[PDB]
RNA sequence: GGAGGUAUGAAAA
RNA sequence: GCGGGGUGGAGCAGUCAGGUAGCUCGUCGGGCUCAUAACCCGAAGGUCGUAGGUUCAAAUCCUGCCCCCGCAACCA
RNA sequence: GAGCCGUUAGCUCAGUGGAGCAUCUGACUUUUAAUCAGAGGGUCACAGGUUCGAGCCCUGUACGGCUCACCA
RNA sequence: GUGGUGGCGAUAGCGAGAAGGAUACACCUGUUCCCAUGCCGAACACAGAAGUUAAGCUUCUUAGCGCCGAUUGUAGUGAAGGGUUUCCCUUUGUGAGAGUAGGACGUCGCCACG
RNA sequence: UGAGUGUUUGUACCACAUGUACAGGAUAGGUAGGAGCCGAUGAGACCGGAACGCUAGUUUCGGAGGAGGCGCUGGUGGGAUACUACCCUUGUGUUAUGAACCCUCUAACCCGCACCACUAAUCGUGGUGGGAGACAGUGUCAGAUGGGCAGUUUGACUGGGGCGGUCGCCUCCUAAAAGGUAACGGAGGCGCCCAAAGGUUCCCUCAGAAUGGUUGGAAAUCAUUCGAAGAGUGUAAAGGCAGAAGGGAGCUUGACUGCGAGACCUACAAGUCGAGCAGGGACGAAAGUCGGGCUUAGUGAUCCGGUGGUUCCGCAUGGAAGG
RNA sequence: AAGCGACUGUUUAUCAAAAACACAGGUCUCUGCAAAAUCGUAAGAUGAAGUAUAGGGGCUGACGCCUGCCCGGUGCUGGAAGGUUAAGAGGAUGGGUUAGCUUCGGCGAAGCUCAGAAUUGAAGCCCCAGUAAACGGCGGCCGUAACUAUAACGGUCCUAAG
RNA sequence: GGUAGCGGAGAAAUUCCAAACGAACUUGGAGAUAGCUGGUUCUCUCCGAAAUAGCUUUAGGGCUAGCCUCGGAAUUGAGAAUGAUGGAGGUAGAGCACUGUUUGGACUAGGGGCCCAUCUCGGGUUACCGAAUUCAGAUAAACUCCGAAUGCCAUUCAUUUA
RNA sequence: GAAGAGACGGAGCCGCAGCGAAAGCGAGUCUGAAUAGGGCGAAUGAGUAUGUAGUCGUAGACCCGAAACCAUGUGAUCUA
RNA sequence: CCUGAGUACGGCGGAACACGAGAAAUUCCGUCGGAAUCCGCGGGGACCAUCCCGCAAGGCUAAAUACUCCCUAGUGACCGA
RNA sequence: UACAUAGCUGAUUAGAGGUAGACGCAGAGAACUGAAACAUCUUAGUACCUGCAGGAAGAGAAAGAAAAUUCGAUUCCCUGA
């Protein structure tokens, strides 16, 4: 994998600038970059789905196995079964080579050296890929995630952000690729399913480019780190881990501004004394001559003069309730729920919330965290008992899957609200890192962590006194990350959240955790740990 | 911004026409209806 | 029991 | 004519690189003290010199203007 | 020699239709000092002019302080 | 006489006032129709003829405004000269603006209906 | 410029070992052959040791014993069983080794070290020791440093020169009623902007004032009247524009291609205008208008280089390179 | 009696004899000997037929009292991890040609040939520390005393230090 | 006797190196180059400038054009002067119709004082300052409702001329 | 061949066809889709060899004149 | 069987070819690497294929050409102190 | 140092140096100047210095010129230009 001279520019805001990058063959290369760095568009370039404005973007003939960074579902009723049979090309080929046969009853001496071609290809391309996968895929499922096999039969829109990934990262390796682009392989999973992600990674022979915002997981697998970065448009490739990134880079930028301080002083010192030429009197001519001297100097200085590169700048959040939070802002009372022909996910669960009391909604993947939460909001209608919000209550809902955007509307368009005025919607979606035409940009272009800021924004624009946040920091950049927690620490209000990320809840402070599918309020603590564990 | 851009035929892949816009403006690719001297009739031309 | 070494607050009444 | 500056009472950030007006001292009020100082707790105090442009948005960018500071205003 | 700068209460300073300090008087104190309060003290250096009207503008005279001040 | 349509510098205009609709033009009656209002059949478009000269419209009176504007005189100035020569004057030619006498409430055409 | 040692390494043979998904009898690597195969040259079963291991078994070494088993056959599975060939993963070694480093050696090279001979000799050349040593020195190449040294550059206008200002383009006044006309004369602008702020069809007329009217105030929006331009025309000024060039709407891209009679301007290079013809179009019923914008600034010769197109050339010829 | 130079000396032959140079003394620095330094392309020389109490270079200039603060910047010295970095090594890939295949099509081995990425690659530079008898540098604003004045005193900005 | 010029020597002055040393002398490249100054030799005849535009590391140089000279070609004679006619233009002058500048008068919004009464509020005042309007009167290179004399362009025009 | 004229020597040069960058076409050709327009040419013909004169180019180029630069050499009998 | 080896050639750095590295032949020098050999080798202006021409890395070779310090015999729209 | 070589002795052999201020080949090799400045470039491989020469030198018998199909060592002249 080699690019030179890339460039890639939509409309007015440019992604890569003569970048450059080359990666060895059997190496474990962890992407990073902040969210909209580019780093889903390489794997596009890679995919030959876009195409550099100039340059050249250089790819090795072996197969590749992508992993979107969303999940690609054509059809709402679609088969967990025939997604993941939809990574191999079996299906496609026969249904051609049925064709083919077709063509050849009708067509007699005509077509034939067409046809004949075609089919043994497709012949020679099945056996490729030997049909027997039809068991062996059966059977990858419970040997990679113990994926159930009722699952299996089930629709796939259906599953849980976390169950979808499983089957997603499954469907990569069912195709059995030479080349691994994983994009977010762990964003959804829970703890003990990217335990095997992780061994998976470390033991597969071959070339895997992963990006993700998980520090420590890339730190178990990678061996070469790629950052992308998102003001100088360029690529730059470090061999070690992320902290060894992290000090090359820290110590390149100290060592950059150290440069651009020195430069700067040589010119205030040539200034300075053009100023004292300038304002000498006219009869001090040898004065006067030196000031023109040096004023063609600090010319030339001023002209070799380094600029610092603007720094980054981070998200910028102040969530404050309108209202006041009561002692029981949420009553929920023996209510039990249970998907039309699945067993009963909870039964009688009855718990009551304080007030600016953060708590958590503990459990695994496909356990009901989300079903609880959309129980709540009232999309899910308890099958039994009442759920009861003090009239003091204000309610924001963060969905797990980012379903709250308008694709074929604008940032400003989602935004905005009969509350606010242009500016302020502006002056917010700056805070948010949507700079002027920023904010006119479609969402169906934007990647997953900028859509997770829009939803985000709404949630603070609502000034609610409870939120309820399922994975919020899903997406988000490690920064950003640490920004959202810490701002939620000093909310002041109730917070019912879910989150598969340790960092994020410990900054968070939770209260009071809920136990899935085995109801438990109890006290937050590392007893936590007691329950993932059991 | 405004810079000049080159409008090329999409059926023969001609750089015709020689125009400017600006980018903050018309951040998309301009097309327009110009005539095509190769093949002599109106066709549509896009910005490279 | 005994010996040596180990912050400010005026003047006069 | 050449530069440097006009942000709270004073001194200073923030200006480059447009989103949100701050730090220090000081002042007012209440505490502690026999009382003062120190210390502790509250509060106030600027629409950023001014007038127009640019912007969705100006302390910040552009233009002019008014003030204050330093220098210069002539060399054989 | 020339051109400017000024002259306002007892002192130091503001200012075309007075402030501090000082001095008195009160309170507080056994009495004071310090505080706090109140009071008085010229008005514009002197003449002339402009103006409806001059401390403010214009002249002249005094008094002082600034500056600049000749040749190869 | 009215209605179309023009030419000519408003001497054609503006203001004020008076008369008429027989025809014609208009207002005028409605939105079913093609068509339309960044709302409104006000406009545009369409269909029709209940009433009116009320208005527009045409005719007429008026010099109040605007417009046109002679002659005389003067400023200026080409040429030829002079002086006490920043300026001023003389001869010869030309000659305004301003001000005024006065003109002017239009004229020269084609077509349809009377 | 040559010897070894060791270490960490990459390559390549040669030894070995491993192959457990499901079902399947069960630890099934793939392909080809495969009815026969192996064993007194010690088979089966058995005992232990060792390795693997997914814990099920697999592989292997040894102890005894002495002749048997395995395969085809059978169903399973996508794939079938023995054994042979080609190999394929995976992990250990052997060897060839290629590198980097480690020290060590000595014979190259060096000694302004000692002694010996030429020999009168503090040169030199040989000889013997000693020291150093594949280093140094020297050759080629390369990076850095290098006023130690060398060759050079380091504007013009200008009420002398310096300092300050200016240098190209557009507009006005100067400019003396054609045009042109200078000053370090008096004033301002330009180095763009617009995807509509272009074209066309249709339609519309402003600024202010008076009066009345909630928030609302001098002044927001609304209504009548007066109101010939006192507005607007992206952007300086001049000229022009209300038969619009100002403003709104619909459709569009003529902000077209090949040109171009004839003019203006002009030292040249350039600059400006242009009816009209052809091609193929936009708008409009048609007339017709459209080769950007109310007009006049918004720009830079050649050389050199980039990108695209090209029925052009192609150093014997076909290509190619290069043009 | 004052300035300058300690002194005797030296200097612009031919407009300057001096406060200029030199000087003894001081200090810093380089130099372990085939010393550093210098002449020379080299050989060969001086340094020395000397050996750190010696030799070269910089500055200061008898003697007496002293020689304050700053190592941020520039040099020099040290450091060796990192970043940057030439030739050389290395040769993944892409063109040209064409044996041979071809469905005008087009593809295309080997050889030669035109370019060539990864990787490897010292010093230096970046960077860290020291160094001023090394090159050099050594600040502002506001208020405050019971006559007035002034500010011992207090705030505040900046700096490497004021 | 030694040190020789891309050098030497220098108690150091750009000091000396054969009577001139910021780089000795001699010979040669060599007739260096000089957009600079000076000089450039007989006669008569015909004609006879320019000291301007544009560009220029250009300004006392140069190039093209303009002005002079010599030869040639051709013309429906295209040049000059004057007259007649028709034109384009905004100067002198004049004027205030626009835009600036501006004087006085009438009136006054409004502003300033000032009282009563305040709920700054409701008034009554300076002949206090006074917008806008209007009457009268000025002014202009970058004002014009107007507008010459001249000059300029042109005429198959007319006379003279070449 | 007399240091001559002259003879021979037709290789070569200029002219007689231009147009286009070129392939190429040709009184036409280039641009262009064009039998259109336009550019350059033909219609619309004189050149060439030599002499001579004017001017220009390469040469010192009308004559004289630097401070200087560079390369061999000669100078420490003055002076350091 | 023999027909010129550290040669031809290549890299690097220079130089000569009208040709200033340019697409650059051809030729030479320094340094390093480094062939084939008759089914072979070189050139025909990068390079490859075909064709054509030639046979390097050994040597010698007169004439036509350049000049005149000199000696002889002359010549001149060459000088005349 | 044993053989020997090196040294030393003798004989033998052929060199030294000068020119003709010319012509030839080679080593090394400027600057003024032109570019209207100047560094690539030009002056120019010139001037100078040095070595080697001969009456001439140098070159010369194709690993050539070509692509008319051919020519047939080199040198010099005209032309190509
Ligand atoms: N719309 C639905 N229709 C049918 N079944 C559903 C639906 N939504 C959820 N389920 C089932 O409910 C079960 C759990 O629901 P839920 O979405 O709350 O999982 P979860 O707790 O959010 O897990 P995680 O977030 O980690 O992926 C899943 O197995 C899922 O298959
Ligand atoms: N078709 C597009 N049009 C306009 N902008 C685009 C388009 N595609 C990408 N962008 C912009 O490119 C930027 C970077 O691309 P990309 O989506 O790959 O970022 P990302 O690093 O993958 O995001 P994340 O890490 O959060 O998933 C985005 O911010 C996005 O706004
Ligand atoms: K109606
Ligand atoms: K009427
Ligand atoms: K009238
Ligand atoms: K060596
Ligand atoms: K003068
Ligand atoms: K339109
Ligand atoms: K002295
Ligand atoms: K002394
Ligand atoms: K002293
Ligand atoms: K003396
Ligand atoms: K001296
Ligand atoms: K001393
Ligand atoms: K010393
Ligand atoms: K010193
Ligand atoms: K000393
Ligand atoms: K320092
Ligand atoms: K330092
Ligand atoms: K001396
Ligand atoms: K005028
Ligand atoms: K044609
Ligand atoms: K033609
Ligand atoms: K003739
Ligand atoms: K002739
Ligand atoms: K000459
Ligand atoms: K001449
Ligand atoms: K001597
Ligand atoms: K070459
Ligand atoms: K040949
Ligand atoms: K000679
Ligand atoms: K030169
Ligand atoms: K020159
Ligand atoms: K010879
Ligand atoms: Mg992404
Ligand atoms: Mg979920
Ligand atoms: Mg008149
Ligand atoms: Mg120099
Ligand atoms: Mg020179
Ligand atoms: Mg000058
Ligand atoms: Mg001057
Ligand atoms: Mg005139
Ligand atoms: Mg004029
Ligand atoms: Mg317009
Ligand atoms: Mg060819
Ligand atoms: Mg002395
Ligand atoms: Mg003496
Ligand atoms: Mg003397
Ligand atoms: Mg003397
Ligand atoms: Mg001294
Ligand atoms: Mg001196
Ligand atoms: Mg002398
Ligand atoms: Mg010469
Ligand atoms: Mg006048
Ligand atoms: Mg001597
Ligand atoms: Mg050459
Ligand atoms: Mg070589
Ligand atoms: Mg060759
Ligand atoms: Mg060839
Ligand atoms: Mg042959
Ligand atoms: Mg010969
Ligand atoms: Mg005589
Ligand atoms: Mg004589
Ligand atoms: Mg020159
Ligand atoms: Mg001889
Ligand atoms: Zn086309």
Redesign the pocket.
């Given at each position: 994998m080699?690019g030179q001279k890339m460039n890639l520019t939509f409309g007015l805001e440019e992604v890569y600038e003569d970048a450059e990058f080359?990666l060895?063959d059997f190496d474990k290369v962890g992407i990073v970059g902040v969210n909209g760095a580019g780093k889903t568009t390489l794997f596009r370039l890679l995919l030959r789905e876009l195409k550099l404005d100039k340059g050249k973007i250089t790819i090795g003939n072996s197969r590749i196995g992508y992993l979107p960074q969303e999940i690609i579902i054509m059809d709402e009723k679609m088969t967990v079964l025939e997604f993941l049979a939809e990574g191999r090309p079996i299906k496609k080929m026969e249904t051609e080579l049925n064709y083919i046969y077709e063509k050849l009853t009708v067509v007699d001496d005509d077509k034939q050296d067409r046809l004949l071609?075609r089919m043994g290809w497709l012949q020679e391309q099945l056996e490729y890929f030997?049909c027997?996968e039809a068991?062996?895929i059966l059977?990858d499922l419970?040997?990679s995630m113990q994926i159930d096999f009722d699952l299996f039969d089930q629709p796939i829109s259906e599953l849980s952000g976390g169950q979808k990934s499983k089957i997603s990262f499954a469907k990569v390796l069912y195709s059995k690729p030479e080349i691994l682009l994983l994009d977010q392989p762990t964003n959804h999973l829970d703890s003990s399913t990217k335990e095997f992600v992780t061994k998976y990674l470390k033991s597969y022979?071959g070339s895997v480019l992963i990006i993700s915002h998980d520090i420590d997981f890339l730190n178990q697998i990678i061996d070469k780190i790629m950052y992308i970065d998102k003001v100088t448009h360029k690529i730059s490739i470090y061999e070690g881990d992320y902290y060894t990134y992290k000090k090359?880079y820290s110590?390149?930028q100290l060592?950059r501004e150290?440069?651009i301080i020195?430069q700067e002083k040589e010119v205030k010192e040539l200034a300075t004394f053009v100023?004292k030429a300038?304002?000498?009197?006219?009869?001090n001519?040898a004065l006067?001559?030196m000031?023109?001297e040096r004023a063609i100097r600090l010319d030339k200085k001023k002209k070799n003069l380094t600029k610092?590169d603007?720094?980054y700048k981070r998200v910028?959040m102040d969530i404050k309730p309108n209202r006041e939070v009561a002692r029981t802002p949420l009553k929920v009372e023996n209510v039990t729920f249970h998907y039309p022909g699945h067993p009963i996910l909870y039964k009688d669960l009855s718990f009551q919330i304080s007030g600016k009391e953060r708590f958590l909604v503990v459990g695994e993947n496909g356990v009901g965290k989300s079903t609880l939460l959309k129980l709540l909001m009232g999309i899910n209608i308890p099958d039994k008992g009442k759920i009861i919000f003090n009239d003091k209550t204000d309610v924001a809902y963060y969905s797990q899957e980012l379903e709250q955007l308008d694709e074929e509307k604008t940032i400003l368009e989602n935004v905005k609200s009969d509350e606010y005025t242009?500016?302020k919607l502006?002056?917010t979606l700056?805070?948010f890192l949507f700079?002027?035409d920023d904010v006119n940009k479609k969402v169906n272009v934007l990647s997953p962590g900028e859509k997770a800021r829009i939803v985000l924004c709404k949630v603070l624009l609502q000034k609610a006194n409870l939120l309820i946040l399922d994975q919020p920091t899903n997406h988000l950049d490690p920064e950003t990350q640490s920004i959202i927690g810490a701002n939620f620490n000093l909310f002041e209000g109730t917070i019912i959240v879910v989150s598969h990320n340790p960092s994020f809840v410990e900054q968070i402070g939770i209260n009071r955790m809920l136990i899935l599918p085995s109801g438990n309020i109890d006290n937050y603590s590392p007893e936590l740990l007691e329950y993932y564990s059991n | 911004m405004?810079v000049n851009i080159t409008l090329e035929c999409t059926s023969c892949?001609?750089?015709n026409?020689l125009?400017?816009?600006?980018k903050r403006?018309?951040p998309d690719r301009?097309e327009?209806?110009?005539?095509c001297?190769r093949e002599?009739?109106?066709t549509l031309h896009r910005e490279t």
């Open positions: 080699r080359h060895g071609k030997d027997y068991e062996s059977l419970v040997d022979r090359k110590e390149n060592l150290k440069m020195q100023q300038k304002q000498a009197s006219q009869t001519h006067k001559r000031g023109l610092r603007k720094v910028k242009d500016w502006r002056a700056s805070n700079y002027d | 405004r892949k001609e750089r026409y125009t400017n816009k600006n403006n018309n301009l327009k209806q110009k005539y001297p002599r009739k109106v």
